[PDB]
Design an enzyme around this catalytic site. Structure first.
Site, PDB file in Angstrom:
ATOM      1  N   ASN A   1       8.827   8.930   5.117  1.00  0.00           N
ATOM      2  CA  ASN A   1       7.662   9.654   4.622  1.00  0.00           C
ATOM      3  C   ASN A   1       6.726  10.074   5.743  1.00  0.00           C
ATOM      4  O   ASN A   1       6.572   9.368   6.747  1.00  0.00           O
ATOM      5  CB  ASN A   1       6.881   8.808   3.597  1.00  0.00           C
ATOM      6  CG  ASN A   1       5.834   7.920   4.250  1.00  0.00           C
ATOM      7  OD1 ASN A   1       4.704   8.359   4.519  1.00  0.00           O
ATOM      8  ND2 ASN A   1       6.206   6.664   4.525  1.00  0.00           N
TER       9      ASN A   1
ATOM     10  N   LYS B   1      -3.228  -4.355   9.544  1.00  0.00           N
ATOM     11  CA  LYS B   1      -1.832  -4.031   9.312  1.00  0.00           C
ATOM     12  C   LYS B   1      -1.251  -3.371  10.556  1.00  0.00           C
ATOM     13  O   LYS B   1      -1.792  -2.383  11.064  1.00  0.00           O
ATOM     14  CB  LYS B   1      -1.677  -3.095   8.106  1.00  0.00           C
ATOM     15  CG  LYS B   1      -0.219  -2.810   7.748  1.00  0.00           C
ATOM     16  CD  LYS B   1      -0.128  -2.160   6.361  1.00  0.00           C
ATOM     17  CE  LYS B   1       1.317  -1.943   5.930  1.00  0.00           C
ATOM     18  NZ  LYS B   1       1.366  -1.358   4.537  1.00  0.00           N
TER      19      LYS B   1
ATOM     20  N   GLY C   1      11.367  -3.760   3.747  1.00  0.00           N
ATOM     21  CA  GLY C   1      12.728  -3.940   3.293  1.00  0.00           C
ATOM     22  C   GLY C   1      12.995  -5.116   2.365  1.00  0.00           C
ATOM     23  O   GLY C   1      14.125  -5.596   2.285  1.00  0.00           O
TER      24      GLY C   1
ATOM     25  N   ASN D   1       1.721   8.555  10.870  1.00  0.00           N
ATOM     26  CA  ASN D   1       1.573   9.946  10.425  1.00  0.00           C
ATOM     27  C   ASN D   1       0.186  10.542  10.613  1.00  0.00           C
ATOM     28  O   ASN D   1      -0.117  11.613  10.078  1.00  0.00           O
ATOM     29  CB  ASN D   1       2.000  10.075   8.964  1.00  0.00           C
ATOM     30  CG  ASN D   1       3.413   9.586   8.743  1.00  0.00           C
ATOM     31  OD1 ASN D   1       4.309   9.907   9.524  1.00  0.00           O
ATOM     32  ND2 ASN D   1       3.619   8.780   7.700  1.00  0.00           N
TER      33      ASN D   1
ATOM     34  N   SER E   1      -1.750   1.422  11.754  1.00  0.00           N
ATOM     35  CA  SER E   1      -0.319   1.518  12.060  1.00  0.00           C
ATOM     36  C   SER E   1       0.441   2.634  11.351  1.00  0.00           C
ATOM     37  O   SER E   1       1.675   2.697  11.443  1.00  0.00           O
ATOM     38  CB  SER E   1       0.370   0.179  11.793  1.00  0.00           C
ATOM     39  OG  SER E   1      -0.001  -0.355  10.532  1.00  0.00           O
ATOM     40  N   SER E   2      -0.262   3.510  10.633  1.00  0.00           N
ATOM     41  CA  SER E   2       0.407   4.683  10.077  1.00  0.00           C
ATOM     42  C   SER E   2       0.950   5.533  11.213  1.00  0.00           C
ATOM     43  O   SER E   2       0.234   5.852  12.152  1.00  0.00           O
ATOM     44  CB  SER E   2      -0.546   5.552   9.268  1.00  0.00           C
ATOM     45  OG  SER E   2       0.109   6.770   8.948  1.00  0.00           O
TER      46      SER E   2
ATOM     47  N   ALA F   1       0.841  -1.184   0.000  1.00  0.00           N
ATOM     48  CA  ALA F   1       0.000   0.000   0.000  1.00  0.00           C
ATOM     49  C   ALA F   1       0.880   1.238   0.000  1.00  0.00           C
ATOM     50  O   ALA F   1       2.025   1.211   0.486  1.00  0.00           O
ATOM     51  CB  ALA F   1      -0.922   0.002   1.219  1.00  0.00           C
TER      52      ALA F   1
ATOM     53  N   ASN G   1      -5.906  -0.421   8.384  1.00  0.00           N
ATOM     54  CA  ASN G   1      -4.610   0.155   8.663  1.00  0.00           C
ATOM     55  C   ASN G   1      -4.648   0.968   9.952  1.00  0.00           C
ATOM     56  O   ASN G   1      -5.120   2.106   9.962  1.00  0.00           O
ATOM     57  CB  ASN G   1      -4.159   1.033   7.492  1.00  0.00           C
ATOM     58  CG  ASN G   1      -2.818   1.694   7.747  1.00  0.00           C
ATOM     59  OD1 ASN G   1      -2.117   1.338   8.692  1.00  0.00           O
ATOM     60  ND2 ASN G   1      -2.450   2.660   6.904  1.00  0.00           N
TER      61      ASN G   1
ATOM     62  N   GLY H   1      12.289   0.479   3.875  1.00  0.00           N
ATOM     63  CA  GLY H   1      13.469   0.019   3.163  1.00  0.00           C
ATOM     64  C   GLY H   1      14.379  -0.848   4.019  1.00  0.00           C
ATOM     65  O   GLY H   1      13.956  -1.425   5.028  1.00  0.00           O
TER      66      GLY H   1
ATOM     67  N   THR I   1       9.499   0.245  -1.204  1.00  0.00           N
ATOM     68  CA  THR I   1      10.696   1.095  -1.225  1.00  0.00           C
ATOM     69  C   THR I   1      11.772   0.630  -2.212  1.00  0.00           C
ATOM     70  O   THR I   1      12.420   1.450  -2.858  1.00  0.00           O
ATOM     71  CB  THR I   1      11.293   1.275   0.199  1.00  0.00           C
ATOM     72  OG1 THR I   1      10.315   1.912   1.033  1.00  0.00           O
ATOM     73  CG2 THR I   1      12.536   2.147   0.165  1.00  0.00           C
TER      74      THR I   1
ATOM     75  N   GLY J   1       0.659  11.511   5.536  1.00  0.00           N
ATOM     76  CA  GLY J   1      -0.540  11.798   6.307  1.00  0.00           C
ATOM     77  C   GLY J   1      -1.847  11.437   5.611  1.00  0.00           C
ATOM     78  O   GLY J   1      -2.845  12.147   5.759  1.00  0.00           O
ATOM     79  N   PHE J   2      -1.853  10.334   4.865  1.00  0.00           N
ATOM     80  CA  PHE J   2      -3.078   9.853   4.214  1.00  0.00           C
ATOM     81  C   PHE J   2      -3.631  10.869   3.208  1.00  0.00           C
ATOM     82  O   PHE J   2      -4.794  11.261   3.299  1.00  0.00           O
ATOM     83  CB  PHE J   2      -4.185   9.548   5.245  1.00  0.00           C
ATOM     84  CG  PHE J   2      -4.020   8.235   5.996  1.00  0.00           C
ATOM     85  CD1 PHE J   2      -3.228   7.202   5.502  1.00  0.00           C
ATOM     86  CD2 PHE J   2      -4.692   8.038   7.197  1.00  0.00           C
ATOM     87  CE1 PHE J   2      -3.099   5.996   6.219  1.00  0.00           C
ATOM     88  CE2 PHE J   2      -4.576   6.839   7.910  1.00  0.00           C
ATOM     89  CZ  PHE J   2      -3.777   5.821   7.421  1.00  0.00           C
TER      90      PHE J   2
ATOM     91  N   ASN K   1       3.995  -2.096   8.892  1.00  0.00           N
ATOM     92  CA  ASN K   1       4.063  -0.730   8.379  1.00  0.00           C
ATOM     93  C   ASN K   1       5.485  -0.168   8.578  1.00  0.00           C
ATOM     94  O   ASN K   1       6.404  -0.902   8.938  1.00  0.00           O
ATOM     95  CB  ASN K   1       3.027   0.144   9.109  1.00  0.00           C
ATOM     96  CG  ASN K   1       2.411   1.208   8.210  1.00  0.00           C
ATOM     97  OD1 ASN K   1       3.123   1.946   7.524  1.00  0.00           O
ATOM     98  ND2 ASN K   1       1.073   1.291   8.211  1.00  0.00           N
ATOM     99  N   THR K   2       5.669   1.130   8.343  1.00  0.00           N
ATOM    100  CA  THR K   2       6.965   1.769   8.552  1.00  0.00           C
ATOM    101  C   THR K   2       7.284   1.969  10.044  1.00  0.00           C
ATOM    102  O   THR K   2       6.385   1.939  10.875  1.00  0.00           O
ATOM    103  CB  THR K   2       7.022   3.130   7.845  1.00  0.00           C
ATOM    104  OG1 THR K   2       5.926   3.941   8.291  1.00  0.00           O
ATOM    105  CG2 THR K   2       6.911   2.949   6.339  1.00  0.00           C
TER     106      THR K   2
END
Ligand SMILES: Cc1cc2nc3c(=O)[nH]c(=O)nc-3n(C[C@H](O)[C@H](O)[C@H](O)COP(=O)(O)O)c2cc1C
Ligand SMILES: Cc1nc(C)c(C(=O)Nc2ccc3ccccc3c2)s1
Ligand SMILES: O=C(O)c1cc(=O)[nH]c(=O)[nH]1
Length: 365
Positions: free
Chosen positions: A114, A224, A304, A186, A183-184, A65, A181, A275, A326, A117-118, A253-254
């Site tokens: 990044n 997620k 990654g 942001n 887990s963002s 995503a 989701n 990454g 990434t 923010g959606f 997520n990140t």
């Protein structure tokens, strides 16, 4: 492959050198949506096929995503060689996301940070876009190329659960699987939805809405999660997932962490890091969630992945499918065939009959 070298050594660094990351991404989405891609020569062999989540997957490598947030490049992504596509995150109302700049490359680390923010075209626009190719997607799915839809929530929404519920109602009928989701890093307060009580309440409503959809339009539901969770957080999530019959997990997520050793000048920018520096943190989270769910809950592993070895490590740790994003920034489109070709070779070398035999293999050692 000659393309791999060319894209890695010449094309991508030149794209990188000429454009800021957001502009480069927009152009990449444009080119992909038009099918302007190098020849994806790789032919998926039968040993890459996976059956999970009520579907056949021609190969286990998906696009994560965030690359196609608004559902604009789905067909081009299958053409690129992905075995499944996930779009989103999509929010109920359109929203612009954070002020720029909001995405940063760390080439010395093969990482990205990044804080979008959606940014999202919203449910209505995405719904019409998916409806316009709904029957073609139905044929792709039957042919082993499923579609996932990742749901987010608006910045200003009071009731997070109603935001996700609206997403299930609007895009659930167009999706093979949905992703909640939570887990963002942001969106303020979002990750607290991973907490046990909040998560149980949220997913009960989500699953209720999902079960209310007609049978052929009824997607699997996945959650997620972040790579930054405590052991307590992870035990609680596994407990809720089993209590509610959640269909799967996307891990991860990140990360808001900044691993020691990062070299990129932009390493201290606010946002989620993705990454290479995320890779093993993600793999370890998969390993833990697989054990906590007794290997009975399908996991999509992400974070990654840029090689067959990276993919296989997540699969052996317990992932049934993997995703990448990434790596595209640094390697371009040829990375997809590269991952698949290396994965097949490693599966043979390690005595596996196919991807399916390798899932969770580390836990049976
Ligand atoms: C620029 C960017 C935007 C992203 N947007 C989303 C998103 O909207 N929803 C989501 O669930 N994950 C999003 N992700 C996370 C990826 O889906 C993935 O979980 C993470 O990047 C780790 O995988 P990777 O190392 O292969 O990039 C985004 C990642 C990046 C780099
Ligand atoms: C025959 C071709 N014409 C064009 C304009 C190509 C191209 O640059 N394709 C790319 C390049 C980089 C990408 C990076 C990410 C996603 C798609 C991408 C497509 S290949
Ligand atoms: O839109 C975002 O900024 C975004 C969402 C998400 O889920 N993960 C991420 O790294 N960024």
């Amino acid at each position: 492959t000659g393309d791999e070298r060319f894209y890695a050594e010449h094309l991508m660094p030149t794209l990188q050198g000429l454009l800021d990351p957001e502009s480069a991404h927009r152009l990449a989405v444009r080119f992909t949506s038009l099918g302007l891609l190098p020849r994806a020569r790789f032919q998926d062999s039968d040993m890459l096929e996976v059956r999970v989540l009520g579907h056949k997957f021609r190969n286990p490598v998906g696009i994560a995503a965030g690359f196609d947030k608004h559902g604009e490049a789905v067909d081009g992504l299958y053409k690129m060689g992905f075995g499944f596509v996930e779009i989103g995150s999509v929010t109920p109302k359109p929203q612009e996301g954070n002020p720029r700049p909001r995405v940063f490359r760390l080439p010395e680390d093969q990482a990205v940070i990044n804080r979008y923010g959606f940014n999202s075209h919203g449910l209505s626009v995405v719904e019409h876009r998916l409806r316009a190719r709904q029957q073609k997607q139905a044929k792709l799915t039957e042919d082993g190329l499923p579609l996932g839809v990742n749901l987010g929530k608006n910045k200003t929404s009071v009731d997070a659960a109603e935001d996700y519920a609206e997403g299930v109602r609007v895009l659930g009928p167009l999706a093979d699987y949905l992703v909640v989701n939570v887990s963002s890093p942001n969106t303020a307060g979002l990750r607290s939805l991973q907490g046990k009580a909040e998560l149980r309440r949220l997913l009960t409503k989500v699953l209720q809405e999902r079960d209310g959809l007609r049978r052929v339009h009824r997607p699997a539901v996945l959650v997620k999660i972040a790579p930054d969770l405590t052991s307590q957080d992870k035990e609680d999530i596994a407990s809720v997932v089993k209590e509610l019959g959640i269909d799967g997990l996307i891990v991860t997520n990140t990360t808001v962490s900044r691993p020691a050793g990062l070299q990129g000048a932009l390493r201290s920018e606010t946002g989620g890091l993705s990454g290479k520096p995320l890779r093993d943190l993600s793999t370890q989270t998969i390993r833990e969630m697989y054990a906590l769910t007794q290997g009975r809950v399908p996991i999509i592993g992400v974070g990654g992945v840029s090689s067959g070895q990276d993919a296989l490590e997540k699969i052996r740790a317990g992932a049934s499918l993997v995703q990448l994003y990434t790596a595209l920034t640094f390697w371009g489109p040829p990375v997809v065939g590269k991952v698949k070709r290396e994965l097949e070779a490693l599966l043979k070398e390690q005595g596996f009959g196919g991807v399916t035999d390798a899932i969770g293999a580390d836990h049976r050692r």
